[PDB]
Amino acid sequence: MSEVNVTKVIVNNPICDILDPFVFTIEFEALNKLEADLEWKIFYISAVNQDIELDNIFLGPIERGVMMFDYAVNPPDYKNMDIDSVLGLQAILISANYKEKEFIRIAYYMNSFYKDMELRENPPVVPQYDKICRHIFVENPRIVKFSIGWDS
Amino acid sequence: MSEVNVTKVIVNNPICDILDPFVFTIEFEALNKLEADLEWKIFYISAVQDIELDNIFLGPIERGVMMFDYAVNPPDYKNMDIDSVLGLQAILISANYKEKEFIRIAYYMNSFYKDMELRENPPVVPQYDKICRHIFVENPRIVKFSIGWDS
DSSP states (O other), X not given: OOSEEEEEEEEXXXXXXXXXXXXXXXXXXXXXXXXXXXXXXEEEEOOOOOOEEEEEEEEOOBOSEEEEEEXXXXXXXXXXXXXXXXXXXXXXXXXXXXXXXXXXXXXXXXXXXXXXXXXXXXXXXXXXXXXXXXXXXXXXXXXXXXXXXXXX | OOSEEEEEEEESOSEEETTSOEEEEEEXXXXXXXXXXXXXXXXXXXXXXXXXXXXXXXXXXXXXXXXXXXXXXXXXXXXXXXXXXXXXXEEEEXXXXXXXXXXXXXXXXXXXXXXXXHHHSOOSSOOGGGEEEXXXXXXXXXXXXXXXXXX
């Protein structure tokens, strides 16, 4: 039923400071030309409280064939977030949409923690976001596909 | 009663193609000068026999702190069981003195196809250039052993 198959997702900087942008290399194959653009979104998932949309971009026109692209998005504003959405188990999710309907989601768990062990053992009362790093679990993508309408 | 303490181990390229060398940064402190060299080995652990990837000698050992980078080449995946290539494996750092092991540090790792179609349908002939390993860095498995030294 799906007109588009996602063939690759590369997490380019799986271990980095949390202030660094998320960078993905994404490959997909269109089985048919589509009249409209594909919409790719990135979501930050907290405290595994609501999901934060990091960015959304449109790609088109969509011809039959394979396309691979780089997608860099900025991190959310950790200063205005619950500390549990900053330190601990989080997730990052790629969402693909057509005509405002999601047809696949790919998410990766990630652990966020202070890089230096003493601050891990004794976290300060005021967080120091410049010394926190995320570790994305690239070997375990969580995928769900959805039946949507396309052009017919 | 150990004369040498291992204070840091950093896995420099924890997520990479399996054909890339393993690179470690290792820090240790000798509480006393030692008459002989330290021997550091790296082992590839299958089906989580073991393959010794390399061994190097460091010396002379003076009292104090030393940090060094240790790069070793991967094993010959073409002559290995596919189950020793894809899946849960391990990589182990071994430190020895006078041919006696006094500490071992190991990390689990998952190795998987980067392309989703080959992940769902792995080929009968492996494509090692398209497999990636993820070394599980925040869970080091350490065991220390009391050995004889110089006294």
